[PDB]
Amino acid sequence: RQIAPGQTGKIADYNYKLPDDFTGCVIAWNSNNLDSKGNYNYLYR
Amino acid sequence: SNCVADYSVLYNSASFSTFKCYGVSPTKLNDLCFTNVYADSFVIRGDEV
């Protein structure tokens, strides 16, 4: 829900900020069946 | 009232589940002056925030 053109939070306001006029699609899905272990490797600045 | 209000002390606290601001943006709050803040405090169900 942070990955939208003008939303805010610990991801979107720092690293992956979308443009205010973003033209595009955001496609997302759960990956618990593939990437859970916990899996302390997936990481954010 | 009659005090200095650091709002980055709140906004950088990773403990908050939401921080919805309706006539101000949270990164602007340190640029601002107000007459009184009025903090209202209570508990509810999480289905109702």
- B5's CB contacts (< 8 A; 6+ apart) are B29, B37
Option in A8, A10, A13 nearest B14 (CB)? A10
- State the Cα–Cα distance between residues A14 and B32, nearest whole angstrom: 22
On whether the CB atoms of residues A38 and A8 are closer than 8 A, the answer is no
On whether the CB atoms of residues B26 and B19 are closer than 8 A, the answer is yes
Beta carbons of B14 and A13 less than 8 Å apart: no
On whether the CB atoms of residues B28 and B36 are closer than 8 A, the answer is no
Name the amino acid, one letter, at A5. P
∠ CA B28-B30-B31, nearest 5°, is 65
- B18's CB contacts (< 8 A; 6+ apart) are B49
Q: How was this structure determined?
A: cryo-EM
On whether the CB atoms of residues A13 and A36 are closer than 8 A, the answer is no
Which residues of chain A neighbour B25 with C-beta distances below 8 Å?
Answer: 8
